[PDB]
Symmetry: C2
Subunit: 451 residues, 2 copies
């Protein structure tokens, strides 16, 4: 109650949920019985109580949006669209506010106009938002001797032991934060925030008040003339696609993902399991065990999925991911997310690309220039290394004649640090690019797209 600073929710006399088709039950249980890395260590009975609450809430997303996303991603996979994915490294309940969310929505719309122009093709916009509340860790004890912070879905950022304990009630606070943020992203994307003219006036402000501004002025002016041309031709906002921003996060906490599963109706074909906590999810580098629960869970859901591929990836293993995760040969169903470091991508990526291409499957190739790039000191990342990874990624694909399909970026609408610091280091986890650096990267990637 208010006196205890808690919301009390009775679980009993809640039930009556329709059973899954027998095969889906069997497969889902088989998937979840496999070993699972990076899971919270909280009690099974408390976890179950939280899942029962979540099994009956309104979903974050609906199946029809997910099949629409799959159709748009199929275009990307065929070389006819580009994927922009970006947002907070880790969302926090603390920053889950209208200014912060609007900041991320705007930054992503800004980047998308620039990339659409540079690419001369549609850009699919996927935010890391409305559920990016869990993060894997190498070590279970951090530099201070505390149990590691694993994101607000699991424990608290505060540096004391009680705050670090794994708290299954965070599954429910994660959901409430997620749907509040998704609700606002839907409102914002059908407001005037999404009109291209407005979005690009922001980019022109960036060009004035920026040290590298002169570098980007020509392209910003070219884009502005392209937009004014559109209107001169009689194209008004009403004659356009309303902005669609999709929600994604790493599918890490299987207690959360399984509780957000819903069965589709009879208007696809056969009923299918959709993870309705997001439109698309990805499986990270530490949870991608080929026979682990995460890959297997991914095989059971209908959502598009991604898999992060680090420097230790082989062509053979990459092909096994494709055959397990895209077994019906559905373009767009699978994204392979390269995160290799700028010093390694030119050498390690081509043989992987060649092998997968040879299978006849059409994956999206997406560059994650964040997580292969890092250095000692504050966790931080050089902008030039990030740019250079995306650059080498484009070189790999140009040489093979394959599609450089997208980028996956960690960013904020906030004027933060990390780009070389103590001034406003604000992240709950990894170094982002601030507003400015994100935008600068879009411009630079637009140039690689024109080339």
């Amino acid at each position: 109650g208010a006196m205890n600073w808690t919301v009390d929710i009775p679980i009993d006399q809640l039930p009556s949920l329709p059973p899954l088709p027998t095969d889906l039950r069997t497969r889902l249980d088989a998937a979840l019985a496999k070993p699972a890395a990076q899971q919270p260590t909280w009690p099974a009975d408390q976890a179950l109580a939280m899942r029962t609450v979540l099994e009956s809430v309104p979903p974050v997303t609906v199946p029809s949006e997910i099949v629409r996303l799959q159709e748009q991603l199929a275009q990307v996979a065929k070389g006819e669209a580009f994927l922009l994915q970006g947002g907070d490294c880790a969302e926090t309940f603390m920053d889950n506010t209208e200014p912060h969310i609007r900041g991320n929505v705007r930054a992503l719309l800004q980047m998308a106009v620039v990339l659409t122009y540079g690419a001369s093709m549609p850009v699919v916009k996927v935010a890391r938002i409305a559920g990016q509340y869990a993060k894997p860790r190498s070590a279970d004890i951090d530099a201070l001797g505390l149990r590691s912070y694993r994101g607000d879905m699991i424990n608290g950022f505060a540096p004391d032991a009680a705050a670090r304990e794994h708290d299954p009630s965070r599954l429910v606070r994660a959901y409430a934060n997620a749907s509040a943020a998704m609700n606002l992203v839907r409102a914002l994307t059908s407001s005037g925030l999404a009109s291209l003219h407005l979005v690009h006036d922001w980019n022109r402000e960036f060009v004035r008040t920026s040290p590298a501004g002169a570098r980007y002025e020509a392209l910003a002016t070219e884009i502005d003339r392209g937009l004014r041309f559109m209107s001169a031709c009689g194209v008004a906002d009403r004659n356009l696609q309303t902005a669609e921003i999709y929600a994604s996060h790493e599918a890490l906490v299987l207690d959360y993902e399984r509780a957000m599963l819903r069965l589709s109706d009879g208007d696809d074909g056969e009923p299918q399991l959709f993870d309705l906590s997001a439109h698309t999810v990805w499986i990270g580098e530490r949870t991608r065990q080929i026979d682990g629960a995460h890959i297997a869970f991914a095989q059971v859901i209908a959502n598009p999925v991604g898999v992060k591929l680090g420097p230790n990836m082989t062509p053979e293993l990459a092909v096994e991911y494709v055959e397990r995760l895209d077994p019906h040969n559905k373009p767009g169903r699978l994204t392979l997310v390269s995160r290799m470091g700028n010093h390694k991508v030119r050498d390690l990526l081509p043989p992987i690309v060649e092998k997968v291409q040879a299978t006849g499957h059409q994956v999206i190739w997406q560059c994650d220039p964040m997580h292969g790039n890092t250095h000692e000191s504050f966790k931080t990342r050089h902008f030039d290394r990030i740019v250079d990874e995306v650059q080498g990624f484009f070189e790999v694909h140009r040489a093979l004649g394959t599609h450089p399909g997208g980028i996956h970026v960690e960013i904020t609408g906030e004027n933060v640090t990390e780009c070389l610091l103590a001034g406003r280091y604000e992240t709950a986890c990894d170094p982002r690019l601030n507003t400015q650096q994100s935008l600068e990267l879009a411009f630079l990637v637009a140039e690689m797209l024109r080339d």
Copy 2:
């Protein structure tokens, strides 16, 4: 806990955003110094703490949707559109589920297409949803000798004393539920659920399987032919609209409404206070004291508002509402909601309408045939006669026809489930018309609209 079948969800105490401007807060404080009827009895310190939580959460609606609704309501006020408002008498946390929300959304869209055809003008769709969690009560002790149930925002439905205490942790729980429901209504209304052709196929199934189906066959077939005609003229899905369903509830719990106040960004007109817990709200019969806090709160917010007018209403008091609540003469800013009873509306409404018309202001005249037509059945249950409901609407139309004024809308309490007289009594409050009856009523009101 484990012994209890209850889970306690901690409410995160998070950093506050900047406060609302001092001048608007000074105005609000003066308004809320007025006495307020029907308020929860929870302590001021708990109420304050809960409000503070809610001052920084993402809003449920945004200012631009509210100004859009205002524009569409101005059309209603001018006799060029029709207002449909409907949904649960009281939403509960327990029934705030995908199936129940989808069923109410469908019912409203179904009713809307029938009334649009009958009216030959646009219908504005306002759901009683995403916040209808508080009800007034005439006594504080119910028939079981317990403190009265006042809605899930205030206390619990369960017939036990602990549940009936007023706990302002329910403010936060209400917010999370409202957000999640609004999220789902946005998703549903840009899915194929919204498609006119799909919607009316439900209407045709209703005609096939209902008794007295043959009474509505002709209009249903007529409407079908109207849709096939527009499709034959090349009109496809995307030339129509996106379905817009707005959220409304009674502004009852001022701690909730005031915590949800936000300042607009000033990119439109100048910055002002909007209640972003909903698009529009109304003030009920028990809380409309001309000098009370509810009417004063309504003066300060930019949202469109309604006031329920019962049988004791005088033409002079009605004019006072117009002067307080539409001082600037903005058509459709105020809706006067007539709930007189079917035996009283023909006599009591005309002098109210005449006097208000004489002001020069353009209110929306909306008929609420529910809260004047309640009784209790011989077999215990609180009920309402369908025929009496129809006749009040009938009477409301006759008053407007005779005056040359616009019968502007209906306000109805309904569900998408097949509810009843002891078989399926499930409301938590007043007897909703079921799916079928609310639909049937739309057919009947369409015929009154054609006349």
